[PDB]
A paper describes a structure:
The RpHpsN structure consists of four molecules arranged as a tetramer in an asymmetric unit. Each RpHpsN monomer contains two smaller domains (domains: C and D) and two large domains (domains: A and B) harboring Rossmann-like folds. Although the electron density indicative of Zn2+ was not observed in protein structure of RpHpsN, ICP-MS analysis confirmed the presence of Zn2+ and Mn2+ in the protein. Residue His320 from RpHpsN is conserved in l-histidinol dehydrogenase (His327) from E. coli MC1061, where it functions as a general base participating in catalysis, implying a potentially similar function for His320 in RpHpsN.
Dihydroxypropanesulfonate (DHPS), a globally abundant organosulfur compound, serves as an ecologically important currency for nutrient and energy transfer from phytoplankton to bacteria in the ocean. A novel chiral-selective DHPS catabolic pathway was identified in marine Roseobacteraceae strains, where HpsO and HpsP dehydrogenases at the gateway to DHPS catabolism act specifically on R-DHPS and S-DHPS, respectively. R-DHPS is also a substrate for the dehydrogenase HpsN.
Residue numbers in the entry:
A (entry chain C): 1 to 217, 227 to 282, 285 to 347, 374 to 406
B (entry chain D): 2 to 11, 16 to 217, 227 to 251, 255 to 347, 374 to 404
C (entry chain A): 2 to 217, 226 to 251, 256 to 347, 375 to 406
D (entry chain B): 2 to 217, 227 to 347, 375 to 407
Amino acid sequence: MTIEYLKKASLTSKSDASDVQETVRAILADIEAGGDQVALDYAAKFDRYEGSIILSPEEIEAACAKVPEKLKADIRFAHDNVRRFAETQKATLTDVELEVVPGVITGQKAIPVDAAGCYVPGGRYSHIASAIMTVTTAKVAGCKHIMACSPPRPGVGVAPAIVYAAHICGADTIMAIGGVQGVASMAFGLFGLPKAKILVGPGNQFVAEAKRMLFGRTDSLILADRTADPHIVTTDLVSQAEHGYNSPVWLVTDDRALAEKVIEMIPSYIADLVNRDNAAAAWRDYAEVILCADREEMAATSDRYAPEHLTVMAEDLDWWLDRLSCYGSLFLGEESLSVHKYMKIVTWQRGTREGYKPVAEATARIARL
Amino acid sequence: TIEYLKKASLDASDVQETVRAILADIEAGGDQVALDYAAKFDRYEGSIILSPEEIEAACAKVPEKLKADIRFAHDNVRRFAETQKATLTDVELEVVPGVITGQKAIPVDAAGCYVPGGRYSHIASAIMTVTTAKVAGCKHIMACSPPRPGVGVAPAIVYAAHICGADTIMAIGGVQGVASMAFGLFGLPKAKILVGPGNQFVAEAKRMLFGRTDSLILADRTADPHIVTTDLVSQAENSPVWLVTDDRALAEKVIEMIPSYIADLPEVNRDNAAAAWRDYAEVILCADREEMAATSDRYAPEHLTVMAEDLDWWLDRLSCYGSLFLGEESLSVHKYMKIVTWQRGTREGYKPVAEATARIA
Amino acid sequence: TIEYLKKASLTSKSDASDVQETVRAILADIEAGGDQVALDYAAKFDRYEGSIILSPEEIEAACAKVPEKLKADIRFAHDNVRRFAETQKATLTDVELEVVPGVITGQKAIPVDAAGCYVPGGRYSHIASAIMTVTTAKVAGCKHIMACSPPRPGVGVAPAIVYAAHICGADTIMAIGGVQGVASMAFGLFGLPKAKILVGPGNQFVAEAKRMLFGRPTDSLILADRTADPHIVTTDLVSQAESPVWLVTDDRALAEKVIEMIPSYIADLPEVNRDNAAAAWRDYAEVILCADREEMAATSDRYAPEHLTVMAEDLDWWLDRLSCYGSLFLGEESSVHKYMKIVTWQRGTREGYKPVAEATARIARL
Amino acid sequence: TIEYLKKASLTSKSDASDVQETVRAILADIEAGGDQVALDYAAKFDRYEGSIILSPEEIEAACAKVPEKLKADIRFAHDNVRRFAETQKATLTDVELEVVPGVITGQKAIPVDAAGCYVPGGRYSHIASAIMTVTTAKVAGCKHIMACSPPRPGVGVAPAIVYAAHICGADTIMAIGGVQGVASMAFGLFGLPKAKILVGPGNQFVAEAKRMLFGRTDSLILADRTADPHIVTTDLVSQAEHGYNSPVWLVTDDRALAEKVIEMIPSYIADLPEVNRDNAAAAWRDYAEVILCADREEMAATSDRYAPEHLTVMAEDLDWWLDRLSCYGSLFLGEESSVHKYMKIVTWQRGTREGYKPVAEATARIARLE
């Protein structure tokens, strides 16, 4: 009503926004609409640094050059410890295969995520340790692309020790951007970067908020090629109308005939289930069918979709088990701060019982993971 | 190089990404965008806020067998809730000689109750959430339910919501409905809590808005600007700060004083302090104490210090805070209640046993 | 062939292998021997020759030695802790829920008969401990509170601890420490009741004795008077071999009637069930003959059954009387928290069908 | 005023009041009586007229009565569980870390001396449990594995349980059940080793017996002729400071040192403040022991047998002590400073800080210490 701002905060007011989140959402939405440029605008405004956002190799050399050899020696020693510890941890996450029942093989794998973003608030000693842990653990984890960002100091750039640590510990990209804009830049794959799948590293409450919002918190997908039995594919897609209030489902195939025949068969099958308004509604709100050219196309699609439930009804099940990388529970065949943080745990199973072994069954129940 | 042979209406990659798109769009757009998404997803050609007439007609459509069923479940939930709420009396405790700490349960201004349909589980849910929110004492209860085309909100839901105390019955579902309650669209208050089951979209748009610090000093003409300035300056020990006053004079004197105090610190402290004051602190002028307190509550600060006359009035009136320090000196009703803690006074002597006893809890 | 150039008065080999082993030894000796052996172990370990249970006079004389600055301090802390506790205890009401028409479930918080509070000494933290536990045990509503603290030779219990224990509600103040003290409360020595819960910090021996005696189910009991249908008790009793089971009755006839009926009901079970059931009946089941309803109730309570079924007249009486059990089913048809048993009861059968009321009742718990 | 129309086989009253009471009674009886009292309970409750520890003859005879289908089943279960276990065990290699320059902390998993495995009978789930537990303990590296199952009258242990136990790696198969069987493994009766761990499902009696015996800080200093009497005496006195109820041991092979330490103790109790002086004098009297051994081997053997939570070694040939000592909690070398359930995790460290390096410190601190 009245209120008169005798001061006014240059980033947490009202007449700027009401709440930390109102700001954070506003900013993320702005950056998401705008892209590289709106990110850059926020960076300029908040960080006040007019050097490049992604450090060029020369800048890295110049940064590393400013680090006393004593501090470098220290950093390599801390690095040594962390990476040795992490590779220990990583040995415990070996692939498993268990014939739970004769004829049925269940497995697990630890898969590294594509890209990790590591936020570093600055160049303090605690921050250098932070940067080492995060970049080193993410590297040993096997992430294909690691970004380290730190809010620059004006005219100074990224704290030089942060640059050194990031570099020796395995960071693919070193970024001069902080806070909400920085987090978004990694999250959204701005500036030609890949989309960070995990984002680790301490930060102030704006940074913590965008992160809870962006990375905090059941899809189903069926991969089928021309050999898939159109009856079974349509049956499965229909049974996604039991727990299918929500529950998106995708069909990824390389065969036109199959897909069109399935959209075809839906009216006959939806009809033959209380349920059968549900099912129909679900189908055209959530279900999606995608045509592919070759099998690699299907697999890459599947991966970028990272489905919670994955069924493979195609030839060469061995290939599909080898290739596919992002899923929750994979069923092959119609007849069906620590390294851990940077990894998917994926579970798969193939086959159907080719006999009966009650002792072995019960032993499996008792065992599990 | 991929082809969509069949597409789903609900074009984005992921639920969170989609939810954000809708939320951000609606936040800028207001009622009209909310309605737009209502049109698209809800597929229903009626008003969003049900009129007394619409309520009456819906009420008329529920068999008397079901009405009595709903009234009986309501009776049960109400005596149970009223029982619990009787256990939440203000307590104030002379913890150590001279320092009195207290606790209060205060009901939040507005609750949103989501009701996904008219199956018995949903009707139960609606009674549960709306009855409890009512008993807790929420000043405004919104019940919204996904409307079905031509039919509206399941008439049983209307009956339940209405008898159980809902102030607003809304024919809007999913992200648009959640947004409508959260942001105070259609003249409604901004829902502080949102309860009730929902699809994964409803749950996500809810984690964002309600899932997950700030400090304030309330001062009037009697506050001594030295203590106020020290107290605010020591906020560089990040985290926003407010000074809320009704005294034009006081405000400007403190605003004059800060850099002189910033100079008193060791050099690790001084850069941080200057930046913190620069970036996060804000000073606000109000007409009278009533004004000030209302401002304070709308800010709901984690730390609240009161440097004003008539502390008794301040303790009674102030409602939304984390910890209140008065003076320059120092499924269940619980869900709908914020627990506030206040402290008054300073140590009066030293009592080892009482202190050691306090240490535990 | 190893030589002990110095031995521990306690944790030595040839005196025992392990703390746990020593604790077992003492508890066993005390449990068999009783009062005198407890006393002898007190003599051995505390080395103090005043009364074990302080007389009222000893209490007053102990109180008199507490500087009044400290008395007032203790009184003040006690006031806060009581004022805090009564808040929580007000949160433990009696409930009643019509889960389905005709079937009413309950809960109650019941205070245990006797609670024991250990106090390891007389420092300020120890005093706070005593104030905490004795005060809470009183607010909770335990009929008998025993506080013991290890005596200091010639001195007795720390005067501050006597004052705290007394004003906070302790019914008994005991000058005994360690395993012998814990056992004295646990085993109801010296005319004291058997402590149901034991709270309070202590050395490794005290903690071990508490782990064994008070640390930590699907036992079963049926109360029947002559009205119970013998077929029904027989079925329910065998149904535990599907874990101790008791039939507690006051009508001799029923008991004998059911005993003879048992084997035919064992026979008319599938083939895996029959041997297991026969074994269980002889090995885990008991039939106990009582005088009247009263005796049965007292029996049920002393056994503290997890599952309790009442097949008698005046189900309201049993709901009123029976107060040590887990889950009560009446009829053939069917912080302060530490000091209390939570009992849940139900009566009745469906007398109707209210789908909403039922769904909401489902939520009230789940 | 009660009359017992039917009594349960030692579940009744004036037998006992309680499950816990019965278990304590039976356990106390067995600790006193030994083998013979254990046997008494066995005969009484189990009512089985054969031997307790199966001979190779009885084992092979038992094996012979198992249908070849079930043998195949069990072998398939064993093979799965074994391969899985050895995968997990490969992850448990000894690790060594220079957390700070000059300060080396390590971790290792030690297999326990003896695992006892309870098997309640011969039902399918029970066979899975037996395979599961005995195989896991075998892979873990238990030097001695005891399997016991209650014998059935005239038959003995279910031949199936004997088969699983034997192929899965069991060193001893026991025809004894319930409390008496838990007791027999736990107390090392019948010439058997004392079971350090006890795994396996069982009735209320068995579960309480194993809660009693296995449910839920001691200190030891190993010193040889080279240790500093002042250092030892101060640590032992400072073990009567914040841990004066916690037992303390001095294990040495040099009489001279020990005698000197004992003579120094009271003068050191004298030179500290009086809140301390009574507590310490008491603590030394009540909890401290000084044990003289013939040689260092006797020392390490004592140490392991005592299995101390805190262990400090003030002797020469520190590398040897690190290699030799097996059962401790935290080992401090030098005067300066799933297979899992079947294994002790021991942490050791040697050296002192021995430079600075602020980053390594900060990294070690965030690393949650240890």
